[PDB]
Each structure stands twice: as C-alpha cells, then as structure tokens.
Ligand binder design. Structure first.
Ligand SMILES: NC(=O)[C@H]1C=CCN([C@@H]2O[C@H](COP(=O)(O)OP(=O)(O)OC[C@H]3O[C@@H](n4cnc5c(N)ncnc54)[C@H](O)[C@@H]3O)[C@@H](O)[C@H]2O)C1
Ligand SMILES: Cc1cc2nc3c(=O)[nH]c(=O)nc-3n(C[C@H](O)[C@H](O)[C@H](O)COP(=O)(O)O)c2cc1C
Length: 364
C-alpha cells in the first residue's frame, strides 16, 4: 500500500502519507488550548505521522467561531506546549494552522464588538449564516476594508504567531488561505473589489498571500511553512471567475518565494469540495500539483482507495483526511488494515464538551 511508504517532507521523515487535516472543533475554551485537545491529538497521532491542528487565531480580531485556540499570547503558547509534547511522545510531526477569518465573523467574536476586517466592505451574503456561541445561526455583518498599513500589521500578526508556534514546540505552521477566510477574501475576484495595489489583477490579488508566506518563511524557515488554498471551493461567497488560473498564479508565487529564499516550503495543501465532477476535479488537483515545485497534499472527499490511487499515480505526495479522523482516532491503522470505518456525528462537530463527540469515539 503506497500510503505506507515513507516520505521526506523536507526535514521531517514521515512513515506514512495519511495526514490529519485541520479541523475546528471549538473545545479550546476562551481561546486557550485545553487538556481535552491533548487527549484528542494524542489519540490520532502515530509514529512518523503528520498532524495539522485546527485553525488557530493569530490575533484578538482573527476569530469567527467560539472557543477556538489562539497562539498570539504566551499563556496560549504554554498550554499548546503541553499538547505538542504528548504528540511528540508518540513520534508524530505536528504543524499549527494559522487562521484569520476576515469578514467571516460577528461582533460577538470581536473585541469591543468592533466590525470584522476584510479586503472589502461588502458583507458575506445572507445565503450563509454564522454559528453563534449559543448554537443559533446569525447574520454576518458588514466588514471594514483595511488599508495597506493595516495589511502589513496583519502580516506581522502571522509572523509573530509563527514564532510563538515554534516556541510552543510545533514542527511548523500552515497558512490557512482557504474557504473564503481572510486570505481567500484577497485571492478571489468574487470578493476582492479593491482598486488599490491589492485588487484587480492576478498579481495584485496574490500580493497578500505572498507577503504572509514570505514573512513566516523569513521568521521560521521555509521548510517549516505549509500553505493551504482552495481555488474551487465557493464557501462564504468565495468564487473566482477562473479558478485554475488563480490557483496557478498562487503556485507561481510559492515557486518564486522558494527560489528567492533558496529553500522549499514544507508543502502546498490544496483542498476541494468534499461531497461527491470527478474527472474535472481530479484534473484541477493534478494540474496544480504539476505546477508546484515541491511536496503536495491533496484533500477533500478522499477515500482509502482514492488516497492509494493518488499516491500510486504520482498525483499527490500526502493525503489529508478530515471528517473520517473525527470518528476514527485510529484512522491510519484502519486504512492500513482496510478495517471498517465508524460514522461521525455532525451535531458534535462544534460543541464544547471535552469528551462527548470529541474523544469518546472508540479505537478498533
Ligand atoms: N469549520 C470551517 O471553517 C468550515 C470550512 C469549510 C468546510 N467546513 C466543513 O468541511 C466539510 C467539507 O466541506 P464541503 O466542501 O463538502 O462543503 P460545505 O462547506 O459542507 O458546503 C456544502 C453546502 O452546505 C451549505 N453550507 C455550508 N456551510 C454553510 C454556512 N455556513 N451557511 C449556510 N449554508 C452553508 C451550502 O449550501 C454549501 O454549498 C464539511 O463538513 C463542511 O461543513 C468546515
Ligand atoms: C468540523 C470541521 C472543521 C473544519 N475546520 C477547518 C479548519 O480549521 N481549517 C481548515 O483549513 N479546514 C477546516 N475544515 C476542512 C477540513 O480540513 C477538510 O478539508 C474537509 O473536511 C474535507 O476533507 P474530508 O472530506 O476528508 O473531510 C473543517 C472541516 C470540518 C468538517
């Protein structure tokens, strides 16, 4: 099974290619990593396996979900260190995903109830609703379009968060540039209506992600930086008029960052709609992989068989699984044995209980 062949993700020697995709679970009460997260990640960690954490706040204004962890305070760093240590005790490699939601927020999630920030002043349309802390679904508000000095401040929040992740012991970080969140609000021409140097052309729309990646590369080293994008996921109004062209423009910028810094990123991670079309989606994924000079993680709707095929055919180096890892803590082992997989309960994806729907899914 080629999913169980080793792979060198730059400095990290992985024993297999099954990756834990980043998943927000909302157990990090008051944005502080909790003991329950340590139990959750330890259950899923394997010797030589790679894990990516749930999206993690880079600043007080970066959240749009309840009880998501941060890594912008030293208290958060101390609590993350305990979690990273239990994962490393199982021999796994773990990256912290750095996440800013941009306009996908609400006053309940912002300090002083201030407006969320974005590339644009337009709200997400009322086709979409935000999960509120009380479990109801609310209305996304009008965001504030930020100026270019404030863009450079957000880049610095990424840089400081990356340094804090290294202080907590993480092996690296992943830039969350997917799903209609802040970076994607700059990338996608269905959101970015700016008329300054961060809007309009492909080069201008790619400036923000290039600056974020370059800042974290300079701070922690390219080999400790992964980047996640989703050119053809339209979540939260995030559509582009030419998704492949946009994806190839992002890939070209990552290739140039690597050339200019003389080192390769840890990986490019591309995610696609995850609910079953097939040939077209596989061609987009392979085209982005073929354009990128480095390690490629594919994601979204992969099965055991599709993961094996992706690696065997050279279409990806690593395969990330999200939802199946919620309910199969030993998913790596189940994939190795071809053992039946257990269902997940969507109702407890984003609840706060430290056990129920979080660490109580059994092993084989
Ligand atoms: N937590 C996060 O940041 C989410 C970001 C994006 C993807 N999320 C989850 O990943 C998994 C794979 O997502 P997939 O690519 O399959 O698409 P969905 O986001 O599920 O979109 C399917 C349709 O569901 C409706 N829908 C999804 N989210 C919202 C929302 N927030 N408000 C209103 N409708 C919503 C829309 O019809 C979508 O086309 C799903 O469990 C999904 O809920 C997680
Ligand atoms: C509950 C839940 C939370 C998620 N949170 C994140 C997140 O924090 N960051 C991210 O990049 N993607 C997030 N995702 C998307 C997943 O990483 C994954 O790409 C998606 O579920 C599709 O892969 P799958 O078909 O293997 O589940 C989340 C998905 C779910 C279902």
């Amino acid at each position: 099974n080629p999913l169980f062949s080793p792979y060198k993700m730059g400095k990290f020697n992985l024993s297999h290619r099954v990756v834990l995709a980043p998943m927000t679970r909302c157990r990090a009460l008051n944005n502080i990593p909790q003991a329950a997260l340590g139990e959750y990640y330890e259950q899923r960690a394997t010797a030589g396996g790679f894990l990516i954490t749930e999206g993690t706040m880079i600043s007080p204004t970066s959240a749009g979900f309840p009880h998501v962890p941060g890594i912008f305070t030293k208290e958060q760093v101390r609590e993350w260190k305990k979690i990273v240590d239990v994962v490393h005790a199982k021999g796994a490699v773990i990256f912290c995903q750095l996440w800013h939601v941009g306009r996908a927020s609400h006053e309940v999630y912002q300090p002083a109830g201030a407006a969320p920030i974005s590339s644009t002043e337009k709200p997400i349309s009322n086709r979409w609703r935000i999960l509120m802390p009380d479990g109801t679904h609310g209305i996304y508000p009008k965001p504030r379009a930020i100026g270019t000095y404030e863009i450079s401040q957000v880049v610095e929040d990424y840089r400081r968060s990356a340094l804090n992740a290294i202080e907590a012991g993480f092996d690296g970080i992943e830039i969350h540039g997917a799903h209609g969140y802040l970076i994607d609000q700059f990338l996608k021409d269905g959101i970015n209506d700016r008329t300054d140097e961060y809007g309009g052309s492909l080069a201008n729309r790619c400036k923000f992600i290039t600056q974020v990646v370059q800042a974290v590369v300079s701070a922690i080293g390219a080999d400790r930086v992964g980047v996640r994008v989703s050119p053809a996921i339209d979540h939260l109004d995030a559509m582009d008029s030419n998704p492949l062209s946009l994806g190839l423009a992002v890939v070209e910028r990552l290739n140039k960052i690597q050339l200019h810094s003389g080192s390769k990123l840890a990986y490019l991670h591309v995610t696609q709609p995850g609910d079953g079309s097939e040939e077209e989606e596989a061609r987009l994924m392979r085209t982005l992989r073929n354009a990128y000079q480095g390690t490629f993680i594919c994601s979204g709707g992969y099965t055991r068989e599709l993961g094996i095929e992706a690696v065997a055919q050279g279409d990806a180096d690593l395969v990330s699984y999200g939802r199946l890892f919620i309910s199969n803590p030993d998913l790596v082992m189940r994939i190795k044995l071809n053992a039946p997989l257990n269902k997940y309960n969507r109702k407890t994806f984003y609840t706060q209980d430290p056990v129920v729907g979080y660490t109580d899914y059994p092993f084989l």
